[PDB]
PDB file of C-alpha atoms in Angstrom:
ATOM      1  CA  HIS A   4       0.000   0.000   0.000  1.00 15.22           C
ATOM      2  CA  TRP A   5       1.145   3.607  -0.200  1.00 10.90           C
ATOM      3  CA  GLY A   6       3.908   5.191   1.857  1.00 11.02           C
ATOM      4  CA  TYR A   7       6.978   7.307   1.558  1.00  7.97           C
ATOM      5  CA  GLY A   8       9.657   4.915   0.127  1.00  8.88           C
ATOM      6  CA  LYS A   9      11.262   4.477  -3.183  1.00  8.50           C
ATOM      7  CA  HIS A  10       8.740   1.913  -4.261  1.00  8.55           C
ATOM      8  CA  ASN A  11       5.555   3.304  -2.717  1.00  9.95           C
ATOM      9  CA  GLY A  12       6.180   6.992  -2.244  1.00 10.44           C
ATOM     10  CA  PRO A  13       4.651  10.154  -3.671  1.00  8.50           C
ATOM     11  CA  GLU A  14       5.702   9.599  -7.344  1.00 10.74           C
ATOM     12  CA  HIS A  15       3.796   6.294  -7.245  1.00 11.56           C
ATOM     13  CA  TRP A  16       0.549   7.489  -5.697  1.00 10.52           C
ATOM     14  CA  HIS A  17      -1.056   8.500  -8.999  1.00  9.24           C
ATOM     15  CA  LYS A  18      -1.436   4.806 -10.021  1.00  9.74           C
ATOM     16  CA  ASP A  19      -3.905   4.115  -7.241  1.00 10.90           C
ATOM     17  CA  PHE A  20      -5.138   7.700  -6.842  1.00  9.46           C
ATOM     18  CA  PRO A  21      -5.191   9.408 -10.266  1.00  7.83           C
ATOM     19  CA  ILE A  22      -6.247  12.764  -8.740  1.00  9.45           C
ATOM     20  CA  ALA A  23      -2.666  12.955  -7.630  1.00  8.52           C
ATOM     21  CA  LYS A  24      -2.205  14.687 -11.033  1.00  7.47           C
ATOM     22  CA  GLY A  25      -5.274  16.907 -10.533  1.00  8.26           C
ATOM     23  CA  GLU A  26      -5.813  20.632 -10.842  1.00  9.01           C
ATOM     24  CA  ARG A  27      -5.803  21.492  -7.129  1.00  7.61           C
ATOM     25  CA  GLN A  28      -3.208  19.311  -5.427  1.00  7.00           C
ATOM     26  CA  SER A  29      -1.287  20.127  -2.244  1.00  5.01           C
ATOM     27  CA  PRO A  30       1.181  21.038  -0.961  1.00  4.85           C
ATOM     28  CA  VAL A  31       2.546  23.889  -3.057  1.00  2.00           C
ATOM     29  CA  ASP A  32       5.436  26.327  -2.912  1.00  2.87           C
ATOM     30  CA  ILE A  33       4.286  29.731  -1.601  1.00  2.93           C
ATOM     31  CA  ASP A  34       6.036  32.379  -3.675  1.00  2.00           C
ATOM     32  CA  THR A  35       5.861  35.303  -1.283  1.00  2.00           C
ATOM     33  CA  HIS A  36       6.428  37.824  -4.010  1.00  2.00           C
ATOM     34  CA  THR A  37       3.513  36.718  -6.049  1.00  2.00           C
ATOM     35  CA  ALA A  38       0.957  36.010  -3.323  1.00  2.00           C
ATOM     36  CA  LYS A  39      -1.273  39.072  -3.252  1.00  2.00           C
ATOM     37  CA  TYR A  40      -2.515  40.815  -0.235  1.00  2.00           C
ATOM     38  CA  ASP A  41      -6.310  40.552  -0.168  1.00  2.00           C
ATOM     39  CA  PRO A  42      -7.840  43.233   2.051  1.00  2.00           C
ATOM     40  CA  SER A  43     -11.190  41.353   1.829  1.00  2.00           C
ATOM     41  CA  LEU A  44      -9.780  38.473   3.895  1.00  2.00           C
ATOM     42  CA  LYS A  45     -10.747  38.387   7.576  1.00  2.00           C
ATOM     43  CA  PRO A  46      -8.806  37.582  10.625  1.00  2.00           C
ATOM     44  CA  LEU A  47      -8.845  34.000  11.408  1.00  2.00           C
ATOM     45  CA  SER A  48     -10.939  32.896  14.423  1.00  2.00           C
ATOM     46  CA  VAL A  49      -9.462  29.949  16.189  1.00  2.00           C
ATOM     47  CA  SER A  50     -11.693  28.891  19.151  1.00  2.00           C
ATOM     48  CA  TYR A  51     -10.032  25.989  20.900  1.00  2.00           C
ATOM     49  CA  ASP A  52     -10.945  26.712  24.549  1.00  2.00           C
ATOM     50  CA  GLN A  53     -13.375  23.717  24.751  1.00  2.00           C
ATOM     51  CA  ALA A  54     -11.355  21.319  22.635  1.00  2.00           C
ATOM     52  CA  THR A  55     -11.460  17.731  23.888  1.00  2.00           C
ATOM     53  CA  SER A  56      -8.628  15.636  22.855  1.00  2.00           C
ATOM     54  CA  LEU A  57      -9.160  11.887  23.262  1.00  2.00           C
ATOM     55  CA  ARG A  58      -6.405   9.758  21.795  1.00  2.00           C
ATOM     56  CA  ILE A  59      -3.085   9.644  19.906  1.00  2.00           C
ATOM     57  CA  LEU A  60      -2.676   7.103  17.161  1.00  2.00           C
ATOM     58  CA  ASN A  61       0.328   5.761  15.092  1.00  2.00           C
ATOM     59  CA  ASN A  62      -1.344   5.065  11.787  1.00  2.00           C
ATOM     60  CA  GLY A  63       1.752   3.900  10.055  1.00  2.00           C
ATOM     61  CA  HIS A  64       2.290   7.203   8.130  1.00  2.00           C
ATOM     62  CA  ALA A  65       2.300   9.751  11.012  1.00  2.00           C
ATOM     63  CA  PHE A  66       0.647  10.089  14.405  1.00  2.00           C
ATOM     64  CA  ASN A  67      -2.761  11.594  14.775  1.00  2.00           C
ATOM     65  CA  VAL A  68      -3.999  13.518  17.901  1.00  2.00           C
ATOM     66  CA  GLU A  69      -7.829  12.965  17.755  1.00  2.00           C
ATOM     67  CA  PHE A  70     -10.583  15.077  19.053  1.00  2.00           C
ATOM     68  CA  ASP A  71     -14.189  14.738  20.011  1.00  2.00           C
ATOM     69  CA  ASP A  72     -15.956  16.339  17.063  1.00  2.00           C
ATOM     70  CA  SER A  73     -19.513  15.335  18.192  1.00  2.00           C
ATOM     71  CA  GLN A  74     -20.207  19.033  19.163  1.00  2.00           C
ATOM     72  CA  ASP A  75     -18.998  22.616  18.278  1.00  2.00           C
ATOM     73  CA  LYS A  76     -16.162  22.483  20.690  1.00  2.00           C
ATOM     74  CA  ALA A  77     -12.991  23.473  18.776  1.00  2.00           C
ATOM     75  CA  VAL A  78     -13.857  25.486  15.685  1.00  2.00           C
ATOM     76  CA  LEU A  79     -12.171  27.497  12.981  1.00  2.00           C
ATOM     77  CA  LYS A  80     -14.096  30.287  11.301  1.00  2.00           C
ATOM     78  CA  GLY A  81     -13.337  33.546   9.586  1.00  2.00           C
ATOM     79  CA  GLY A  82     -10.313  34.037   7.512  1.00  2.00           C
ATOM     80  CA  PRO A  83     -11.219  32.942   3.997  1.00  2.00           C
ATOM     81  CA  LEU A  84     -13.963  30.627   5.293  1.00  2.00           C
ATOM     82  CA  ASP A  85     -17.750  30.779   5.043  1.00  2.00           C
ATOM     83  CA  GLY A  86     -19.309  28.993   8.003  1.00  2.00           C
ATOM     84  CA  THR A  87     -17.908  26.846  10.740  1.00  2.00           C
ATOM     85  CA  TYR A  88     -15.316  24.121  10.663  1.00  2.00           C
ATOM     86  CA  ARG A  89     -14.851  21.612  13.537  1.00  2.00           C
ATOM     87  CA  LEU A  90     -11.506  20.246  14.626  1.00  2.00           C
ATOM     88  CA  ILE A  91     -11.167  16.457  14.143  1.00  2.00           C
ATOM     89  CA  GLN A  92      -7.414  15.823  14.367  1.00  2.00           C
ATOM     90  CA  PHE A  93      -3.941  17.115  14.048  1.00  2.00           C
ATOM     91  CA  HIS A  94      -0.773  15.507  12.777  1.00  2.00           C
ATOM     92  CA  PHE A  95       2.705  16.402  11.556  1.00  2.00           C
ATOM     93  CA  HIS A  96       5.053  15.803   8.670  1.00  2.00           C
ATOM     94  CA  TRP A  97       8.813  15.816   9.304  1.00  2.00           C
ATOM     95  CA  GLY A  98      12.200  15.071   7.958  1.00  2.00           C
ATOM     96  CA  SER A  99      15.228  12.839   8.546  1.00  2.00           C
ATOM     97  CA  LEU A 100      17.259  16.105   9.055  1.00  2.00           C
ATOM     98  CA  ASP A 101      16.310  19.595  10.010  1.00  2.00           C
ATOM     99  CA  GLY A 102      16.691  20.860   6.408  1.00  2.00           C
ATOM    100  CA  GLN A 103      13.581  19.085   5.201  1.00  2.00           C
ATOM    101  CA  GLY A 104      10.228  17.885   6.455  1.00  2.00           C
ATOM    102  CA  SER A 105       7.609  20.476   5.604  1.00  2.00           C
ATOM    103  CA  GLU A 106       5.099  19.913   2.811  1.00  2.00           C
ATOM    104  CA  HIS A 107       4.472  23.523   1.924  1.00  2.00           C
ATOM    105  CA  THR A 108       7.579  25.550   1.159  1.00  2.00           C
ATOM    106  CA  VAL A 109       8.067  29.369   1.287  1.00  2.00           C
ATOM    107  CA  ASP A 110      10.169  30.683  -1.601  1.00  2.00           C
ATOM    108  CA  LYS A 111      11.486  27.051  -1.899  1.00  2.00           C
ATOM    109  CA  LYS A 112      12.513  26.991   1.773  1.00  2.00           C
ATOM    110  CA  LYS A 113      11.733  23.712   3.529  1.00  2.00           C
ATOM    111  CA  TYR A 114      11.060  23.790   7.282  1.00  2.00           C
ATOM    112  CA  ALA A 115      11.954  20.951   9.637  1.00  2.00           C
ATOM    113  CA  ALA A 116       8.327  19.927  10.025  1.00  2.00           C
ATOM    114  CA  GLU A 117       4.747  21.025   9.440  1.00  2.00           C
ATOM    115  CA  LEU A 118       1.693  20.664  11.644  1.00  2.00           C
ATOM    116  CA  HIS A 119      -1.761  20.212  10.117  1.00  2.00           C
ATOM    117  CA  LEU A 120      -4.900  20.950  12.149  1.00  2.00           C
ATOM    118  CA  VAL A 121      -7.763  19.405  10.237  1.00  2.00           C
ATOM    119  CA  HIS A 122     -11.283  20.750  10.426  1.00  2.00           C
ATOM    120  CA  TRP A 123     -14.507  19.796   8.616  1.00  2.00           C
ATOM    121  CA  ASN A 124     -17.381  22.017   7.480  1.00  2.00           C
ATOM    122  CA  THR A 125     -20.325  21.521   9.751  1.00  2.00           C
ATOM    123  CA  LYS A 126     -22.768  22.094   6.940  1.00  2.00           C
ATOM    124  CA  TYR A 127     -21.956  18.569   5.642  1.00  2.00           C
ATOM    125  CA  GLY A 128     -22.664  16.804   8.939  1.00  2.00           C
ATOM    126  CA  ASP A 129     -19.650  14.462   9.157  1.00  2.00           C
ATOM    127  CA  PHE A 130     -16.069  14.262   8.012  1.00  2.00           C
ATOM    128  CA  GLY A 131     -16.707  11.512   5.435  1.00  2.00           C
ATOM    129  CA  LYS A 132     -19.392  13.638   3.719  1.00  2.00           C
ATOM    130  CA  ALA A 133     -17.220  16.767   3.985  1.00  2.00           C
ATOM    131  CA  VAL A 134     -14.266  15.305   2.079  1.00  2.00           C
ATOM    132  CA  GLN A 135     -16.575  14.844  -0.916  1.00  2.00           C
ATOM    133  CA  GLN A 136     -17.061  18.636  -1.217  1.00  2.00           C
ATOM    134  CA  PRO A 137     -14.780  21.313  -2.591  1.00  2.00           C
ATOM    135  CA  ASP A 138     -15.255  23.391   0.582  1.00  2.00           C
ATOM    136  CA  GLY A 139     -15.440  20.452   2.932  1.00  2.00           C
ATOM    137  CA  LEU A 140     -12.240  20.904   4.944  1.00  2.00           C
ATOM    138  CA  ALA A 141     -10.097  23.711   6.309  1.00  2.00           C
ATOM    139  CA  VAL A 142      -6.557  22.760   7.262  1.00  2.00           C
ATOM    140  CA  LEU A 143      -4.454  25.120   9.374  1.00  2.00           C
ATOM    141  CA  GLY A 144      -0.806  24.531   8.498  1.00  2.00           C
ATOM    142  CA  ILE A 145       1.961  25.630  10.812  1.00  2.00           C
ATOM    143  CA  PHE A 146       5.689  25.372  10.113  1.00  2.00           C
ATOM    144  CA  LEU A 147       8.169  24.107  12.651  1.00  2.00           C
ATOM    145  CA  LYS A 148      11.757  25.313  12.878  1.00  2.00           C
ATOM    146  CA  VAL A 149      14.399  23.930  15.222  1.00  2.00           C
ATOM    147  CA  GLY A 150      15.527  26.269  18.010  1.00  2.00           C
ATOM    148  CA  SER A 151      13.964  26.782  21.408  1.00  2.00           C
ATOM    149  CA  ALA A 152      11.679  24.070  22.805  1.00  2.00           C
ATOM    150  CA  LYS A 153       7.931  24.447  22.436  1.00  2.00           C
ATOM    151  CA  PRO A 154       6.580  23.725  25.904  1.00  2.00           C
ATOM    152  CA  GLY A 155       3.118  22.971  24.587  1.00  2.00           C
ATOM    153  CA  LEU A 156       4.473  20.210  22.412  1.00  2.00           C
ATOM    154  CA  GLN A 157       6.263  18.294  25.176  1.00  2.00           C
ATOM    155  CA  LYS A 158       3.156  16.321  26.247  1.00  2.00           C
ATOM    156  CA  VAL A 159       2.938  14.954  22.691  1.00  2.00           C
ATOM    157  CA  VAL A 160       6.617  14.109  22.579  1.00  2.00           C
ATOM    158  CA  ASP A 161       6.332  12.423  26.051  1.00  2.00           C
ATOM    159  CA  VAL A 162       3.748   9.872  24.737  1.00  2.00           C
ATOM    160  CA  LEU A 163       5.408   8.804  21.521  1.00  2.00           C
ATOM    161  CA  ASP A 164       7.365   5.951  23.125  1.00  2.00           C
ATOM    162  CA  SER A 165       3.995   4.273  23.851  1.00  2.00           C
ATOM    163  CA  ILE A 166       2.943   4.410  20.158  1.00  2.00           C
ATOM    164  CA  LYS A 167       6.170   3.413  18.466  1.00  2.00           C
ATOM    165  CA  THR A 168       4.778   1.229  15.844  1.00  2.00           C
ATOM    166  CA  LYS A 169       1.888   1.205  13.356  1.00  2.00           C
ATOM    167  CA  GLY A 170      -1.487   0.509  14.934  1.00  2.00           C
ATOM    168  CA  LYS A 171      -0.640   1.554  18.425  1.00  2.00           C
ATOM    169  CA  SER A 172      -2.754   4.110  20.221  1.00  2.00           C
ATOM    170  CA  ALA A 173      -2.903   5.658  23.654  1.00  2.00           C
ATOM    171  CA  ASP A 174      -5.363   7.742  25.721  1.00  2.00           C
ATOM    172  CA  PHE A 175      -4.539  11.386  25.162  1.00  2.00           C
ATOM    173  CA  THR A 176      -6.998  13.468  26.948  1.00  2.00           C
ATOM    174  CA  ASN A 177      -6.865  17.099  28.095  1.00  2.00           C
ATOM    175  CA  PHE A 178      -4.331  18.205  25.519  1.00  2.00           C
ATOM    176  CA  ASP A 179      -4.674  21.843  24.616  1.00  2.00           C
ATOM    177  CA  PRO A 180      -3.817  22.568  20.917  1.00  2.00           C
ATOM    178  CA  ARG A 181      -3.563  26.263  21.675  1.00  2.00           C
ATOM    179  CA  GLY A 182      -0.088  25.552  22.905  1.00  2.00           C
ATOM    180  CA  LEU A 183       0.968  24.694  19.332  1.00  2.00           C
ATOM    181  CA  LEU A 184       0.101  28.075  17.753  1.00  2.00           C
ATOM    182  CA  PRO A 185       2.526  30.916  16.977  1.00  2.00           C
ATOM    183  CA  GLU A 186       2.007  34.393  18.190  1.00  2.00           C
ATOM    184  CA  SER A 187       0.607  35.861  14.868  1.00  2.00           C
ATOM    185  CA  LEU A 188      -2.284  34.463  12.837  1.00  2.00           C
ATOM    186  CA  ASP A 189      -1.170  36.094   9.601  1.00  2.00           C
ATOM    187  CA  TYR A 190      -1.677  33.575   6.771  1.00  2.00           C
ATOM    188  CA  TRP A 191      -1.649  32.587   3.195  1.00  2.00           C
ATOM    189  CA  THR A 192      -4.627  30.764   1.689  1.00  2.00           C
ATOM    190  CA  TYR A 193      -5.355  28.770  -1.441  1.00  2.00           C
ATOM    191  CA  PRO A 194      -7.664  25.903  -2.587  1.00  2.00           C
ATOM    192  CA  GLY A 195      -6.088  22.457  -2.506  1.00  2.00           C
ATOM    193  CA  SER A 196      -6.184  18.877  -1.384  1.00  2.00           C
ATOM    194  CA  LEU A 197      -5.370  16.346   1.250  1.00  2.00           C
ATOM    195  CA  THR A 198      -1.653  15.671   1.104  1.00  2.00           C
ATOM    196  CA  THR A 199      -2.009  11.932   1.639  1.00  2.00           C
ATOM    197  CA  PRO A 200      -4.116   9.407  -0.266  1.00  2.00           C
ATOM    198  CA  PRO A 201      -6.944   9.693  -1.168  1.00  2.00           C
ATOM    199  CA  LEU A 202      -5.677  13.190  -2.139  1.00  2.00           C
ATOM    200  CA  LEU A 203      -9.201  14.572  -2.317  1.00  2.00           C
ATOM    201  CA  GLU A 204      -9.572  18.121  -3.564  1.00  2.00           C
ATOM    202  CA  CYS A 205     -11.656  19.332  -0.612  1.00  2.00           C
ATOM    203  CA  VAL A 206      -9.403  21.638   1.368  1.00  2.00           C
ATOM    204  CA  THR A 207      -9.164  25.372   1.933  1.00  2.00           C
ATOM    205  CA  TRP A 208      -5.577  25.714   3.060  1.00  2.00           C
ATOM    206  CA  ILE A 209      -4.671  28.308   5.662  1.00  2.00           C
ATOM    207  CA  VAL A 210      -0.855  28.356   6.111  1.00  2.00           C
ATOM    208  CA  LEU A 211       0.468  30.561   8.916  1.00  2.00           C
ATOM    209  CA  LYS A 212       3.377  32.823   8.122  1.00  2.00           C
ATOM    210  CA  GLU A 213       5.031  32.577  11.517  1.00  2.00           C
ATOM    211  CA  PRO A 214       6.694  29.224  12.311  1.00  2.00           C
ATOM    212  CA  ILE A 215       6.790  27.728  15.792  1.00  2.00           C
ATOM    213  CA  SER A 216      10.085  26.759  17.356  1.00  2.00           C
ATOM    214  CA  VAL A 217      10.699  23.287  18.642  1.00  2.00           C
ATOM    215  CA  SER A 218      13.886  21.910  20.071  1.00  2.00           C
ATOM    216  CA  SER A 219      16.206  19.442  18.337  1.00  2.00           C
ATOM    217  CA  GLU A 220      15.442  17.000  21.141  1.00  2.00           C
ATOM    218  CA  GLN A 221      11.679  17.286  20.414  1.00  2.00           C
ATOM    219  CA  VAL A 222      12.078  16.602  16.754  1.00  2.00           C
ATOM    220  CA  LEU A 223      14.525  13.807  17.343  1.00  2.00           C
ATOM    221  CA  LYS A 224      11.756  12.068  19.303  1.00  2.00           C
ATOM    222  CA  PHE A 225       9.449  12.223  16.268  1.00  2.00           C
ATOM    223  CA  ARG A 226      12.204  10.526  14.246  1.00  2.00           C
ATOM    224  CA  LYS A 227      12.284   7.534  16.656  1.00  2.00           C
ATOM    225  CA  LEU A 228       8.770   6.508  15.632  1.00  2.00           C
ATOM    226  CA  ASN A 229       8.378   3.596  13.259  1.00  2.00           C
ATOM    227  CA  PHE A 230       6.380   3.185  10.076  1.00  2.00           C
ATOM    228  CA  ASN A 231       6.350  -0.630  10.620  1.00  2.00           C
ATOM    229  CA  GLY A 232       4.206  -2.631  12.977  1.00  2.00           C
ATOM    230  CA  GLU A 233       5.358  -4.378  16.150  1.00  2.00           C
ATOM    231  CA  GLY A 234       7.915  -7.033  15.600  1.00  2.00           C
ATOM    232  CA  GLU A 235       8.462  -6.200  11.942  1.00  2.00           C
ATOM    233  CA  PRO A 236      11.912  -4.899  10.436  1.00  2.00           C
ATOM    234  CA  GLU A 237      12.470  -1.381  11.774  1.00  2.00           C
ATOM    235  CA  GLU A 238      12.015   1.496   9.352  1.00  2.00           C
ATOM    236  CA  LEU A 239      12.221   4.865  11.061  1.00  2.00           C
ATOM    237  CA  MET A 240       9.217   7.228  10.542  1.00  2.00           C
ATOM    238  CA  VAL A 241      11.051  10.085   8.790  1.00  2.00           C
ATOM    239  CA  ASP A 242      10.522  12.007   5.574  1.00  2.00           C
ATOM    240  CA  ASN A 243       6.754  11.511   5.643  1.00  2.00           C
ATOM    241  CA  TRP A 244       6.156  14.598   3.471  1.00  2.00           C
ATOM    242  CA  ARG A 245       4.743  15.010  -0.015  1.00  2.00           C
ATOM    243  CA  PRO A 246       6.775  17.461  -2.138  1.00  2.00           C
ATOM    244  CA  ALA A 247       5.302  20.635  -3.658  1.00  2.00           C
ATOM    245  CA  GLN A 248       2.868  20.089  -6.544  1.00  2.00           C
ATOM    246  CA  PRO A 249       2.127  22.306  -9.532  1.00  2.00           C
ATOM    247  CA  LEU A 250       0.121  25.465  -8.658  1.00  2.00           C
ATOM    248  CA  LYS A 251      -1.795  25.344 -11.983  1.00  2.00           C
ATOM    249  CA  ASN A 252      -4.678  27.695 -12.178  1.00  2.00           C
ATOM    250  CA  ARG A 253      -4.534  28.967  -8.567  1.00  2.00           C
ATOM    251  CA  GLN A 254      -3.882  32.087  -6.658  1.00  2.00           C
ATOM    252  CA  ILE A 255      -2.334  32.222  -3.239  1.00  2.00           C
ATOM    253  CA  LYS A 256      -3.676  35.138  -1.174  1.00  2.00           C
ATOM    254  CA  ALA A 257      -2.091  36.817   1.793  1.00  2.00           C
ATOM    255  CA  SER A 258      -3.960  38.131   4.817  1.00  2.00           C
ATOM    256  CA  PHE A 259      -1.226  40.665   5.536  1.00  2.00           C
ATOM    257  CA  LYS A 260       0.669  43.418   3.842  1.00  2.00           C
TER     258      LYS A 260
END
């Protein structure tokens, strides 16, 4: 099945998922000089005070921090969005080395990692219905650079030893995703896709300009995870990023001057 290797990685995905060659694929390179400021864009509203994390999962590609999305508890609104989008999960993409790992790039610069907070449009009732719509999802993307530790990340890092291999999960309650946000909510936005199979073209991307800092020790703990299942040959979970895809007929808009 699909992954990140030489034989199953991103250049192969189109054979099982032909939309991989579609008109609105993600990620993309953000050319800061050509993204236009759009004064019609609103501030983003991130309302995570009542978020209810439940569990962390190693799904064999990344790890997912899952939320209770059975009520309007953790919602994204505003920005480029019409209506209300509910948080369902977050996950990261990262590299083998600090010079790579992000999916989006900024003027061809790759960050050490990228965090995706995934939200679905409440007007479609559930996530599975939402991904079938062009405005079904809003993903908040946040770059990670290596420097100072991010204290709000350490609880995630802490737990990774318990979910080393594919299919392992652990209780992960009371985790506050606000501790993963940068100071500014300035952003770029464009229409795109999920960055993993099935690559559905259902996402409004909101990519924050300001990266968060994490320490080398934090990232090094992500790179100790395994893509394999228990008792199978060890293959370190690194370089689980899709490279930039063609922009095609899209505009990237900036919320800031």
